[PDB]
Amino acid sequence: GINPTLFIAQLINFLLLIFILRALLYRPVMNLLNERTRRIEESVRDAEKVREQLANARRDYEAEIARARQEAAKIVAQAQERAKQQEAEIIAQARREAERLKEEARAQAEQERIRMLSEAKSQIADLVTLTASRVLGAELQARGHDALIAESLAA
Amino acid sequence: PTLFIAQLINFLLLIFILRALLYRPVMNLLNERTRRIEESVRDAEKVREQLANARRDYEAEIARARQEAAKIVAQAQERAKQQEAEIIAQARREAERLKEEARAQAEQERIRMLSEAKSQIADLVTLTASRVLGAELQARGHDALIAESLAAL
Amino acid sequence: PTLFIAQLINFLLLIFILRALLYRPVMNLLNERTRRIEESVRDAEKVREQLANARRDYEAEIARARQEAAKIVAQAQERAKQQEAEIIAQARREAERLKEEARAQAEQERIRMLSEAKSQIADLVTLTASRVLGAELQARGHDALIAESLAAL
Amino acid sequence: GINPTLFIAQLINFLLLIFILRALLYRPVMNLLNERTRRIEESVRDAEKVREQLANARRDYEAEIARARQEAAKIVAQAQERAKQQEAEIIAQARREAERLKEEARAQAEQERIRMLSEAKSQIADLVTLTASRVLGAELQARGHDALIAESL
Amino acid sequence: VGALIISIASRFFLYTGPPHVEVAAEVIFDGIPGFPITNSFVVAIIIDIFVIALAVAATRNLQMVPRGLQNVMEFILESLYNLFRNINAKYVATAFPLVATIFLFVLFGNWFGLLPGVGSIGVCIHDTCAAQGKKLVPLFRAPAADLNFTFAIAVISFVFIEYWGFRALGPGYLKKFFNTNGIMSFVGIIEFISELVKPFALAFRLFGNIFAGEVLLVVMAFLVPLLLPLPFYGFEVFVGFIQALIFALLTYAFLNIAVT
Amino acid sequence: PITNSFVVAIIIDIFVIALAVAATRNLQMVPRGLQNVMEFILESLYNLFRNINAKYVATAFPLVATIFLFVLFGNWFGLLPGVGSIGVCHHDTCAAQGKKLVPLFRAPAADLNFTFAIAVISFVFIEYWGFRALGPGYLKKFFNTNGIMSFVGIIEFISELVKPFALAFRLFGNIFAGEVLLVVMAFLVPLLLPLPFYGFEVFVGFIQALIFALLTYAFLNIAVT
Amino acid sequence: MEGLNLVATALAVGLGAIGPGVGIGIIVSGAVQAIGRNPEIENRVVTYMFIGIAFTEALAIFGLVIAFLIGFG
Amino acid sequence: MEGLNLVATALAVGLGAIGPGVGIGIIVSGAVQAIGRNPEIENRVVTYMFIGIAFTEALAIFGLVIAFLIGF
Amino acid sequence: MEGLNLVATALAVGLGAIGPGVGIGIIVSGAVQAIGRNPEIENRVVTYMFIGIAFTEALAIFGLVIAFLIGF
Amino acid sequence: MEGLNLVATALAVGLGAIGPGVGIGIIVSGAVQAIGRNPEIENRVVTYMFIGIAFTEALAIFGLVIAFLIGF
Amino acid sequence: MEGLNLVATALAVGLGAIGPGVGIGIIVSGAVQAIGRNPEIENRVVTYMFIGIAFTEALAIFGLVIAFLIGF
Amino acid sequence: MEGLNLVATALAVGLGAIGPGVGIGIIVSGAVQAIGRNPEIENRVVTYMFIGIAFTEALAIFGLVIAFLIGF
Amino acid sequence: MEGLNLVATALAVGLGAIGPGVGIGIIVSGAVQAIGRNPEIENRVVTYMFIGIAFTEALAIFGLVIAFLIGF
Amino acid sequence: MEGLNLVATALAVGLGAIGPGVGIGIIVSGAVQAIGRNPEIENRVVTYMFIGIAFTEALAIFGLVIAFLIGF
Amino acid sequence: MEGLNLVATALAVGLGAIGPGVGIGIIVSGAVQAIGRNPEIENRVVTYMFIGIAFTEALAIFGLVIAFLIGF
Amino acid sequence: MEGLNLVATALAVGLGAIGPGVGIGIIVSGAVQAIGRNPEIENRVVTYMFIGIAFTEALAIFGLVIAFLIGF
């Protein structure tokens, strides 16, 4: 036979053991859960980490191209400034060095040519060597009358 | 009992002998689990320190970007002042071409004027010789040349 | 005993059952086997007689080939002698026509040389006539009569 | 009933049965069977011999015809070579006869040169016509020539 | 036809007419001083003379084209030849006169055992002599039901296989007599025991498979004698044919396994 | 009154409580030592029970964990030296004033009293939680539902009744058979003979301890479903 | 035990007809499956089946004769 | 100890039926599996299936008749 | 013996049902496996399965009726 | 003897479950394997399975009724 | 006499648990093989496997009950 | 009879283990083969093998206790 | 016991054939299946088939001889 | 009687060895076949081999224990 | 009783041939299957057959010893 | 009874040679087939075949030693 009292005592002991084991293992189960299952939030934190790694880098690259366009604008602006500086420097004095001299040289040529034409000594230097040149081989027999001989160099 | 004691001693010896070999693979498995937990907490802590350091990473990237911007706009200013020198050198070379290709051409025009004046005065002296010097012989008989031509035949 | 009667009854029933169940397929199998073997032996004897016929046909073909070769060589010799006779006749006629051509050429040369001799005689007589007329003119032929005839017109 | 005597006697009966059956069926029936198999393989070999014999009969007929053609060709080649020799001889004879005909033509030319002796019959008789007699009037008043008639050249 | 199966003919003197069992192992017919002739020996002669007469009829005027008895004899002989050549192709010629005649003798012996009068006729329920005090010793007992015939066949086959196993592969026989090393030494004694068993197994197989069939036929004649033992008549025809063919097959297979 | 099985059950209770208290005394990540062993065992059992049914793996887990941790240690206590030899005496080493040499250390599962407790508690567990989320359909016999479906529906009910009986009987039978085999082989040859049976006994004890929890959870899974 | 020979002749046939029955069943099943998978060899391997069948029946036959040798001596 | 003929008949029937039943079961299973694998080779399968069934049922009838003899 | 008839009845019912307890099982298993491998050969496998089942139940019923003779 | 009817009841029950016990197992295993090889053929197969299970069950029940006569 | 009840209980327990044991073994083997071939069919093969197990265990439990009644 | 309880308990504990041994063997062989076919399904196979073995082993256990009820 | 030697002969013949009967069947069935799978390998597999058959037959003839000796 | 203990011990040992022998044979054959088909899971199936064999072996040990309780 | 030694020898031989007969059958069937599936391994694998088969015979031979000792 | 020791001694060997006889056969057949399917895994299946054979032979040796104890 089987004693009912022994079975009841065994059942009570088993229930007490189950309760004590559950109470003692609730802490280890919670610790293991917090240690292991929490890492899903760690994975989404890795996702946020890559998101923040690309985010600030995007603005960094945007500023990297912004400085490039900014310096390009300044370079073009100063190229225009140099263009307007040199163009103004190659008109006002360029004409003075190009077209002013163009008639200044002619003016001085006129000033020297009028002196040359004023050289009546050169006018009388020739017109006498032409004697004994295909005509009138003798030195002089018409006495060199200057009624019209002296009249020359109309210009 | 002596027989019971001997049986218990033999059972304990065999149990220990088997348990050593059983625990050796069990020790290896426990070490593997410990290493897995160690790496699974190490990745978590390095992830958390990277998350903490992201704030400093923002400022570091911003400062690097701004100092790079300062240095590259300094390079731009250097390029701009180089372009200044290039443009001014081109302008001065053009000025040199102005003072050379015009003054020399001016003197060339002046010497051409001198040459044409020389030709004009030569033609003028020839005309004067034909005018009066030719008339200088018509008064003085003007028959010597005709006599020479008649004699030459 | 009734056991003998029962055995007779069941044996005759079994024989009747087997007659309507096993006679026809075994008979068909036997008939198929004997038909196959008789067809095989008929094919064997047909092959043997066909080999004999093939030997006879080979002998006949050899005889036909021998007769064909004999008539071919006979007609070839006949054609050879006929061609020899024909070429002899054509060579003889070629020689005769060549001889006749040579004779005709000789006669033509003879008559042409006779004509050439006549022309040479005419040239000689004209030259001698000119010579004698010139001699007579140098001696007596200088007359006013020939001039008068020339001027008569 | 396992008595040795009956068992031995029955075994002897079975041995007698084995010997009579070997001497009655197992030798003759297998003899017939392997004789049939030998007939089958002999017929297969006979068919192979038949096809080989047809092929070699055709080949031998073709070879015989080819040899007949070859000997006919050599016969006609010998005949035509003899023909070529004969015609070469005949054309040589024709050439020499043509040379002889040219020789007798030259002989006829020499006979014409002999015939050239016709001075008195015609030449002196015609040169008198080719004189002032030909000239109009034919007076010949002292215009004759006693010796120049026979001079010629 | 239809469904006219009434089986009323089966209800004809179910067990009152034929005797109860009336079976035995072996008996003696005698008839001559000295050798105790049995009824099995009578059939072993009446089958031997039958086989010889069949052989003479089949080979009578051997024609090129088979016909009738010659045809069926050729078919049986060539089928057996091919069956044996399927196992071994070298010793068919030598072993054929024994093995084929084992088949041709055992087959007609078994089929004679199903002829009417195998148990009913006895030269020597109440039957004839059975009613008399003298026992109705049955004549015409199938030879394969005799333990003096099956053992004779088995010992002849055993002598043949031993002779042709010693004439081939050399007289060594080290596979079963004795081996030096390995488990082959343990296998050899078992192989020798099996080889010694082999003729006993063959003889007991044939004798039992025929005697039990004959006893079955008699006892099922005892109860419902008419039209019930027909399927078992057919089954015993088939079993006789089998036990005839398999005896020859096993003889040749054992010969081949001994040669190899 | 009490027996010699209850004292070993109490010492197993003390051992389990001490092990659990030692494991829970220092709870931290990266376990190493006794707490690591306990955590690995518990998680392996958790996965094993998840494979059958993941819905109740987190609900009946402490019960089966206690069942395993008790039956395993009770079975292992039977092979320890001193078990079956130490006598309380109310041939036998206690031959003078003979009292059959009652063994002080009797394995907890080697009786018909303790082992029946787990059987009846598992029976009331399957009956309770089976009726928790099924209503009358849990123990429904399906009377002629698919052609006299009652007949099969009836023969299955007695199987459910004897399943705890079968479990308790198998646990007691294997434990008692192991103990008697150890005693017999000890009597035959006192040394080096029961070596194949010493390790066999502990392996069988552990295997049955695991299979008790496995079978109870399988019955719970096939009960709710 | 006046009727123990009846139990003997029952056991002689009953036992010894179990093994051969399963043997014949296995033989026929195997041969049928083999010729089903490879029909072209059916005419060849059947001869091996009809041997083995009788082999097994041999043992069963050894059960019967002894039975007939038990009830009749 | 009368009545032993009863247990003799029962033993003969049972021990002669426990074998052939399994034998013909295996025979039918093998035949039906071979037929299901391919149905073309059917008659040349049912022939051997029924041959084996007849042999095994003949063994069963051996047992049944030797039992009926004790019953007789 | 006062009870041997009951033991004979029990043997005749129990023994002689082991064979027709495994034979039918193997027959039905083979039949359903052939059905699963080939669903369109249903009739030609079901008829043979039922033929084999009847063949085995023939031995089963023979044992039962011999038990009834031992009893009724 | 006097307790022989108890042995008769035991033999009738005990020997009547050896055959059907294996038969039901073989039938269920075959049907389940056929279902696993081809789920779509399950329904039909199930019916045949329940045809196979019932048959052998009868031969178990045929034993049981003996225990309900001898035992009762 | 004086112990045949014990032999009856023993025979019932024993013989009533050698058919169902093999039946359960074959059922579980076939079900597990079908699981291995197809996992998704699990829900459709565990049910029938448990039905067959219930049938064979019912046979065994009936044997045990018949034994215990003799024991009582 | 004297000493029949000994043969009774021996018969029970022996006959109870000739069936479940084969059942456990078949179960383990099938489970191992199925694991071999598909290793990834073992977690769903072992959980059905073990509960199979118990379903078998309990039957043999029904012998032992009965033997302990007969022997003791 | 007034005919125990008859029971001895029956057991020696009967029990000595239920083992070899299955063994010869398994041997020849395996041989036939292997022949069907690979028709080429025939002349050599039969050599081992027949030595296995010879060993099994020797095992059975051991029982037959033992029965005959008891009969003598 | 004077020697019923001996036959009890022998019967217990033999019947406890009848089943587990076949069980261990089937277990080892299946495990070896699975290893041969897939050698990468050897330690995976051998683990399920031994823990199956013990499950079978224990049954035989059960009988042995009873034997050592009867003979002694 | 009196002729108990005869039935002892009979039981020894018969039950020593029950198991090894099926063992030889299964060994030779497996070896034959292996030869048919892979002839090249024969020279090795048949050895593994022989070193197995003798072991199985080592059981039956044991019975034969008890066959002669009891007979002596 | 006087020869009960003899029948016990014979029964122990005979019944203990039934299980291991089939177990060794199954083990050797499985190992042989695995060898044939994969010769590269020779040792890793020979070891387990020998282990299983050792287990079954250990059961047979337990039977033999019990028979020797009864014999002596």
d(CA F67, CA F69): 6
The answer to whether residues E176 and E188 touch, using CB atoms and an 8 Å cutoff, is yes
**Chains N, L in contact, 3 or more Cβ pairs below 8 Å:** yes
By Cβ distance, the residue of F17, F23, F70 closest to A28 is: F23
Nearest CA in chain O to E182: O51
Per-residue tokens: I46: 């079901």
Coil, strand or helix at A90: coil
Is the Cβ pair N69, L64 closer than 8 Å? no
Per-residue tokens: L42: 């073992």
The count of structural domains within chain L is: 1
The answer to whether residues D47 and C47 touch, using CB atoms and an 8 Å cutoff, is yes
The count of structural domains within chain D is: 2
Tokens 């005993």 found at: C1
What DSSP state is assigned to residue E21? -
d(CA G18, CA H19): 4
Question: What are the DSSP calls for K17-68, one per residue?
Answer: TSHHHHHHHHHHHHHHHHHHH-STTHHHHHHHHHHHHHHHHHHHHHHHHHHH
Among the listed residues M12, L38, O37, the one whose alpha carbon sits nearest the alpha carbon of residue P32: O37
d(CA F102, CA B34): 46
For residue C32, give its domain range: 2-152
| Backbone φ and ψ of E175, nearest 5° | -65, -25
Find the discontinuities in chain D where C to next N exceeds 2.5 angstroms and give the residue preceding each. Answer: none
Helix axes G4-14, G42-70, angle to 10 degrees: 170
Residue type, position J47, single letter: T
Per-residue tokens: D38: 């030998």
Nearest CA in chain O to M57: O21
By Cβ distance, the residue of K3, K9, K28 closest to L27 is: K28
Against chain G, the chains showing at least 3 CB pairs within 8 Å are: E, H, M
Among the listed residues J18, P57, J56, the one whose alpha carbon sits nearest the alpha carbon of residue L22: J18
Using a CB–CB cutoff of 8 Å, tell me whether A61 touches chain F.
no
Size of interface J-K (CB pairs under 8 A): 154
Against chain E, the chains showing at least 3 CB pairs within 8 Å are: C, D, G, H, M, O
Count of beta carbons in the 10 Å neighbourhood of residue A120: 11
Count of beta carbons in the 10 Å neighbourhood of residue C52: 12
Tell me how close the Cα of E7 comes to any Cα of chain C, in angstroms. 14
Size of interface D-E (CB pairs under 8 A): 102
Residues from chain E contacting residue C41 (CB–CB below 8 Å): 64-65
d(CA F176, CA F5): 12
Residue E172: inside a domain: yes
Among the listed residues E88, E96, E93, the one whose alpha carbon sits nearest the alpha carbon of residue E257: E88
By Cβ distance, the residue of I10, I46, I57 closest to J70 is: I10
Per-residue tokens: E259: 């040669």
Among the listed residues D105, A64, O53, I3, the one whose alpha carbon sits nearest the alpha carbon of residue B69: A64
Torsional sign, CA N48, N49, N51, N53: positive
Coil, strand or helix at B2: helix
Residues from chain F contacting residue A4 (CB–CB below 8 Å): none
D110 and D124, same structural domain?
no
Question: What are the DSSP calls for P3-32, one per residue?
Answer: -HHHHHHHHHHHHHTTHHHHHHHHHHHHHH
The answer to whether residues O4 and P1 touch, using CB atoms and an 8 Å cutoff, is yes
Q: Which residues contact H8 (CB under 8 A, 6 or more apart)?
A: G3, G6, G7, G9, G10, H67, H70
Tell me how close the Cα of H68 comes to any Cα of chain G, in angstroms. 10
C153 class by beta-carbon count within 10 Å (0-12 exposed, 13-18 middle, 19+ buried): exposed
**Helical residues (DSSP H) of H1-72, grouped into ranges:** 4-37, 43-71
Q: Between the CA atoms of D51, D55, D60 and D62, what dihedral angle is there, to the nearest 10 degrees?
A: 150
CA atoms within 13 A on the CB side of I33: 23
Q: Between the CA atoms of A14, A15, A16 and A18, what dihedral angle is there, to the nearest 10 degrees?
A: 90
The answer to whether residues A86 and B90 touch, using CB atoms and an 8 Å cutoff, is yes
Solved using:
cryo-EM
The answer to whether residues N9 and N67 touch, using CB atoms and an 8 Å cutoff, is yes
For residue K17, give its domain range: 4-71
Is the Cβ pair N29, P24 closer than 8 Å? no
Among the listed residues E17, E19, E39, the one whose alpha carbon sits nearest the alpha carbon of residue E219: E19
By Cβ distance, the residue of J27, J35, J71 closest to K41 is: J35
Per-residue tokens: D56: 């070699």
In sequence order, what are the beta bridge partners of F103?
A: F87
Q: What is the CATH number of the domain that holds M59?
A: 1.20.20.10
Q: What angle (nearest 5°) sits at the alpha carbon of residue F125, between those of residues F120 and F129?
A: 155
Alpha-carbon distances, residue E176 vs B10, E187, E191, F195, J67 (angstroms): 48, 7, 5, 41, 56
Nearest CA in chain N to L13: N63
Is the Cβ pair O64, M69 closer than 8 Å? no
d(CA F201, CA F180): 11
Is the Cβ pair E55, D16 closer than 8 Å? no
**Chains E, H in contact, 3 or more Cβ pairs below 8 Å:** yes
Is the Cβ pair D6, E148 closer than 8 Å? yes
Residues from chain N contacting residue L32 (CB–CB below 8 Å): 27, 30-31, 34, 45, 48-49, 52
Using a CB–CB cutoff of 8 Å, tell me whether F204 touches chain L.
no
D128 and D56, same structural domain?
no
Tell me how close the Cα of F82 comes to any Cα of chain L, in angstroms. 25
For residue F215, give its domain range: 4-224
The answer to whether residues E113 and E120 touch, using CB atoms and an 8 Å cutoff, is no
D128 and D82, same structural domain?
no
**Chains H, N in contact, 3 or more Cβ pairs below 8 Å:** no
Using a CB–CB cutoff of 8 Å, tell me whether E241 touches chain H.
no
Coil, strand or helix at E10: coil
Tell me how close the Cα of O55 comes to any Cα of chain E, in angstroms. 10
The answer to whether residues E153 and O20 touch, using CB atoms and an 8 Å cutoff, is no
Using a CB–CB cutoff of 8 Å, tell me whether E183 touches chain O.
yes
d(CA O28, CA O30): 5
D123 and D112, same structural domain?
no
The answer to whether residues F202 and F79 touch, using CB atoms and an 8 Å cutoff, is yes
Question: What are the DSSP calls for chain F, one per residue?
Answer: ---HHHHHHHHHHHHHHHHHHHHHHS--SS--SHHHHHHHHHHHHHHHHHHH-SSSTTTSHHHHHHHHHHHHHHHHHTTSTTTTT-B-----S-TTTT-TT-BS---GGGSTTHHHHHHHHHHHHHHHHHTTTTGGGTT---TTTTSSHHHHHHHHHHHHHHHHHHHHHHHHHHHHHHHHHHHHHHHH-SSSSSHHHHHHHHHHHHHHHHHHHHHHHHHHHHHH-
